[PDB]
mmCIF file with all atom_site columns, C-alpha atoms in Angstrom:
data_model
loop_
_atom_site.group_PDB
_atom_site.id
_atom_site.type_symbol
_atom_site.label_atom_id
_atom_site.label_alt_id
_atom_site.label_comp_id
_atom_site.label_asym_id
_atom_site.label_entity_id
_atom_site.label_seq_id
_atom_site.pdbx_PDB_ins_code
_atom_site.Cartn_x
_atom_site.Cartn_y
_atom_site.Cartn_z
_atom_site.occupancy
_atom_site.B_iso_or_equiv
_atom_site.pdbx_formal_charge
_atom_site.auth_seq_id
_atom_site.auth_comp_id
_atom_site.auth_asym_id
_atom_site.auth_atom_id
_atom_site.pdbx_PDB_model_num
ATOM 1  C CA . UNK A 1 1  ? 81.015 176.890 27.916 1.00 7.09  ? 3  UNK A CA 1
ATOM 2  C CA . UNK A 1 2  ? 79.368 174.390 29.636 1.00 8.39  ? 4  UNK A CA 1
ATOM 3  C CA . UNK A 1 3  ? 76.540 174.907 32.374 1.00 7.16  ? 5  UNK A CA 1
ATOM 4  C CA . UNK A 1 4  ? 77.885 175.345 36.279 1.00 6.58  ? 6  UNK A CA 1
ATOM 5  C CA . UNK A 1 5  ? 79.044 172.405 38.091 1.00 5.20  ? 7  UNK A CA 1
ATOM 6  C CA . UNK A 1 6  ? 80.050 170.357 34.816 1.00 4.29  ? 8  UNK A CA 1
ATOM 7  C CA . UNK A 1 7  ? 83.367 169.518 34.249 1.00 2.00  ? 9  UNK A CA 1
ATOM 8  C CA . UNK A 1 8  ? 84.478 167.577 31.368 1.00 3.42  ? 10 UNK A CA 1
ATOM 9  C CA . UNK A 1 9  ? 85.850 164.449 31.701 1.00 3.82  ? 11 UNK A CA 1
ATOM 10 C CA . UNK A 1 10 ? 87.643 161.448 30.651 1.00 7.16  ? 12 UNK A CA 1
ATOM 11 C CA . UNK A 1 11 ? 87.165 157.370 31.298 1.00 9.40  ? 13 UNK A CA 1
ATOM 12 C CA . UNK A 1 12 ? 90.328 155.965 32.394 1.00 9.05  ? 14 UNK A CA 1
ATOM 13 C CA . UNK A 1 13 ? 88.224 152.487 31.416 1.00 10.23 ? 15 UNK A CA 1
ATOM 14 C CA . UNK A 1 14 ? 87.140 153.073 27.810 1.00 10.72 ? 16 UNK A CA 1
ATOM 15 C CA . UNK A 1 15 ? 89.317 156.309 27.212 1.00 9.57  ? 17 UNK A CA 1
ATOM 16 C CA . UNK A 1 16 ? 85.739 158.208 26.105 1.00 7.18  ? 18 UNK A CA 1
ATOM 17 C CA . UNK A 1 17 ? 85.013 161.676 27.144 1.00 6.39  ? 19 UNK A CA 1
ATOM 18 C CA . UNK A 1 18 ? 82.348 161.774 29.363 1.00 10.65 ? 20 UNK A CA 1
ATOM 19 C CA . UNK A 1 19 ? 80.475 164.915 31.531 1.00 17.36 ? 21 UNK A CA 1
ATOM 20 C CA . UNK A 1 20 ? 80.556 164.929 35.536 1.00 14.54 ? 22 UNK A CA 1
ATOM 21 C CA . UNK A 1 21 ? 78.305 167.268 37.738 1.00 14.17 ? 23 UNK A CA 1
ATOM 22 C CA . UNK A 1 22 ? 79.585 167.921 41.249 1.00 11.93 ? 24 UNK A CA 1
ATOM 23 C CA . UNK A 1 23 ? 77.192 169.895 42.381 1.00 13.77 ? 25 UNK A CA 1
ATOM 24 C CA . UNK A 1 24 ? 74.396 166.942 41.326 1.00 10.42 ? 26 UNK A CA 1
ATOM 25 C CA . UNK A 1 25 ? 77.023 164.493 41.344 1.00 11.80 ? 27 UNK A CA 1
ATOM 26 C CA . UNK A 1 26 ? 75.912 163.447 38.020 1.00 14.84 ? 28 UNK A CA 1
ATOM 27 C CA . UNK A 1 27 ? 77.477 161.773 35.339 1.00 16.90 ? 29 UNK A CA 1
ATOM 28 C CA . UNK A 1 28 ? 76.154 161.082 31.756 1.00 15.03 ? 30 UNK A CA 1
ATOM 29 C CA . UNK A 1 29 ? 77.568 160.452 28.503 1.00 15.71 ? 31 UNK A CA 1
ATOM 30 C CA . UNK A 1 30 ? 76.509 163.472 26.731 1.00 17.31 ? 32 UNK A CA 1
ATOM 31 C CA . UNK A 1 31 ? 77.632 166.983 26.507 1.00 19.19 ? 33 UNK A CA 1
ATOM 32 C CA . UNK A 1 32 ? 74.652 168.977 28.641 1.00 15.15 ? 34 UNK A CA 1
ATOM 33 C CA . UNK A 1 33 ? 72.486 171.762 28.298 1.00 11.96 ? 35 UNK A CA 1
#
């Protein structure tokens, strides 16, 4: 389960999984918490 507001996602550039925020609207590489 990941914290509120992330949603996993995926880079239609490199095809990596990345992690997207929209309550922040951040984005990072890493799983959070």
């Amino acid at each position: 389960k990941l914290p509120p507001g992330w949603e996993k996602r995926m880079s239609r550039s490199s095809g990596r999984v990345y992690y997207f925020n929209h309550i922040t609207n951040a984005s990072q590489w890493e799983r959070p918490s």
